[PDB]
C-alpha cells in the first residue's frame, strides 16, 4: 500500500501552487488581451 | 498601427491563454480528485502498475 | 501534509495494534484460566508431555 501511494497520489502541495500559478497567467493573459484589442483602434485617429 | 483585419498578437494571446487553461483544468482536475492518475490521460505504465 | 487518499503513518499504527492485542488476549486468556498451555495453540511437546 505504501508502496502504490507514491505512484498515485495528489500531493496537494504541488497542486496547490500549479493552481495559483495558472489562475496568474490566466488573468494576466485576460488583463493583456484586453489590453491588446484596443491596438487596432488608432486607425480612426488617422483616418479624421 | 497598420494592419486591423489581423491582430496576431490577439492570438498569440489567445494560444498562451489556451495552453495554460488546459493546464489549470489538469490541476482542478486533480485537486478535486484524490488520485494523481485520474483516468490516465496521464502516464499509462503508472497505472498499469 | 501532501498526500489524503492514504495514510500509512495510521495503517502502520494499526498494524502495531493489532500486534499487541494478540499479545493482550494471550495473557489475559491466559491470566483466566490457571494453565500456562491452555489447550495448546502453543508449544504441543509440553501438551504431550
Given at each position: 500500500s505504501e508502496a502504490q501511494s507514491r505512484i498515485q497520489d495528489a500531493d496537494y502541495a504541488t497542486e496547490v501552487s500549479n493552481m495559483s500559478k495558472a489562475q496568474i497567467i490566466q488573468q494576466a493573459g485576460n488583463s493583456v488581451l484586453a489590453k491588446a484589442?484596443?491596438?487596432?483602434?488608432?486607425?480612426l485617429s488617422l483616418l479624421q | 498601427a497598420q494592419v486591423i483585419n489581423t491582430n496576431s498578437l490577439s492570438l498569440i494571446t489567445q494560444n498562451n491563454i489556451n495552453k495554460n487553461q488546459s493546464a489549470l483544468s489538469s490541476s482542478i482536475e486533480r485537486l478535486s480528485s484524490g488520485?494523481?492518475?485520474?483516468?490516465?490521460?496521464?502516464?499509462?505504465a503508472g497505472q498499469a502498475i
Open positions: 484589442n484596443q491596438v487596432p483602434q488608432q486607425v | 488520485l494523481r492518475i485520474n483516468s490516465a490521460k496521464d502516464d499509462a
